[PDB]
């Protein structure tokens, strides 16, 4: 008799990694949970709820507010923002870049919009508290949030927590449907996750996601997937390879394989 947890454990051993998985239960399906209550660094996965917080806090007209910044605001990696130092970027453009290009400057600017220059990470955490998440915490802005040592609770979430956050944001009622549609669209057009959860699900499944990558071999992806018949699931996959040191290689393929196991039981 097979056991999916044993297969996740095999993946761990094969990649010399720690893997966390959460797929919330539905009316038709059991939860999938593997190290789901263990802490993993957010890395860039926080950018999706960040955009939700900004959407939540403001009228949609706020998307047109122009944010200006200088070259001294640029934090690697900022594929969009570093090309717009002269023009600035609107809040909407920043949300786009933060999700679709994992743009770090965009994320820091959004944190500043949310909670001001000193308060953004605290404001973000407070948004998660408002969704019922009492475990997650954001402490640093980009790029330091990717660099906490293993064991350090700063800048961490759990697969269970982030999955339930994403569930509420995309499938639930955390956002009104207009704002929900914007978040969903940005995630749907993400340029970063083709080799993660997307790679484990057949082509006839829709996948929207937000990736995260950091030190200690951290590679995460949080997604909402729809079956070919329109049935949605939230899939959170987190990993690290802390045993390898701060410069351990993040392994996208581990997330792809984890997602394959998930798809195998959801299909
Ligand atoms: Na400027």
Author numbering: 26 to 57, 59 to 83, 86 to 145, 145A, 145B, 145C, 145D, 146 to 238, ...
Sentences from the paper on this structure:
The β-lactamase of Mycobacterium tuberculosis, BlaC, is susceptible to inhibition by clavulanic acid. In BlaC, however, the asparagine at position 132 is replaced by a glycine. This substitution effectively removes a side chain with an amide functional group from the active-site pocket, resulting in an enlarged active site in BlaC.
BlaC G132N gave crystals useful for X-ray diffraction, resulting in a structure at a 1.6-Å resolution and Rwork/Rfree factor values of 15.5/18.8%. The structure is overall similar to that of wt BlaC, but notable differences exist. Strikingly, however, the nitrogen of the Asn132 side chain hydrogen bonds (2.8 Å) to the carbonyl oxygen of residue Ser104. An interesting double conformation is also observed for the Ser130 side chain.
